[PDB]
Amino acid sequence: XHLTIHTWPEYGYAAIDLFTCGEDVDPWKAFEHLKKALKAKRVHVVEHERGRYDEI
Amino acid sequence: XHLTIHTWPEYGYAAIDLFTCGEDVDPWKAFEHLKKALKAKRVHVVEHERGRYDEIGIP
Amino acid sequence: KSLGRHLVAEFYECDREVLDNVQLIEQEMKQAAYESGATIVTSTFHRFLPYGVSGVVVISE
Amino acid sequence: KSLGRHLVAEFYECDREVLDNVQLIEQEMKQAAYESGATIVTSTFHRFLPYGVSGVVVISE
Numbered sequence A: 001x002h003l004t005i006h007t008w009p010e011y012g013y014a015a016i017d018l019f020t021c022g023e024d025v026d027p028w029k030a031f032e033h034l035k036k037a038l039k040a041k042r043v044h045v046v047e048h049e050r051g052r053y054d055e056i
Numbered sequence B: 001x002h003l004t005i006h007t008w009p010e011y012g013y014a015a016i017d018l019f020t021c022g023e024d025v026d027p028w029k030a031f032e033h034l035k036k037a038l039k040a041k042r043v044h045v046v047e048h049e050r051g052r053y054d055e056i057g058i059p
Numbered sequence C, D: 001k002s003l004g005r006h007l008v009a010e011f012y013e014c015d016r017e018v019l020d021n022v023q024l025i026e027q028e029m030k031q032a033a034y035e036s037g038a039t040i041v042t043s044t045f046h047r048f049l050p051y052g053v054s055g056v057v058v059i060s061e
Ligand SMILES: *N[C@@H](CC[S@H](C)C[C@H]1O[C@@H](n2cnc3c(N)ncnc32)[C@H](O)[C@@H]1O)C(=O)OC
Pocket: A001, A002, A019, A020, A021, A022, A025, B006, B007, B008, B009, B010, C048, C049, C050, C051, C052, C053, C054, D038, D058, D059, D060, D061
């Protein structure tokens, strides 16, 4: 998978989630586009591995 | 906000996100109900505070 | 403390039949939304072939 | 290495007018999906009052 967004205009804040699957899909490209579109001035991003092979 | 789920039946794996807003909404009961319904035998959960008051502008 | 609380969860060794049942998953996800006290705004679930299920319940306060 | 990659991002000091524009957000969120290389399955956007937007784009490979 999903690409989600939840905005709080009153705070200039946006909670964004970019969950992708496949070697051929890059979530950072989605990030770059949104950072531009929203004109964010400060960002914090944590990258999670979902479904680690050594775990499933 | 959202509750989301993406399943991989071939691996018995499910990626679940429980994102709630407001003190009166508890994402942990959503967790409790899903762990039960999907019969997961093992789980790993990370809890994030989205839009921390001190980061946005409350104080 | 914050606008929202977000649990990023990994569920392992689940009932594989349940995981591949788009009808049951939507049912259980809406129920989970209910148990949390959240208001359901919208819901959309997709069934992948040969197997797999994706779903989202957009909620509110 | 893992089935998926998941970015949990916090965006601060955004263009508030853009943040409260439900149509624009849908456009950008969908282009973002294209930019990433993903295939869009469906998307649902909703707007809150007095302000606020929520949107979800379901994808696949
Ligand atoms: N948003 C995720 C979606 C993950 S899906 C729900 C994983 C399950 O779906 C099966 N599947 C079948 N065909 C596909 C394609 N084309 N992409 C992904 N998953 C597919 C899997 O075998 C699994 O059971 C996402 O894929 O992000 C891009």
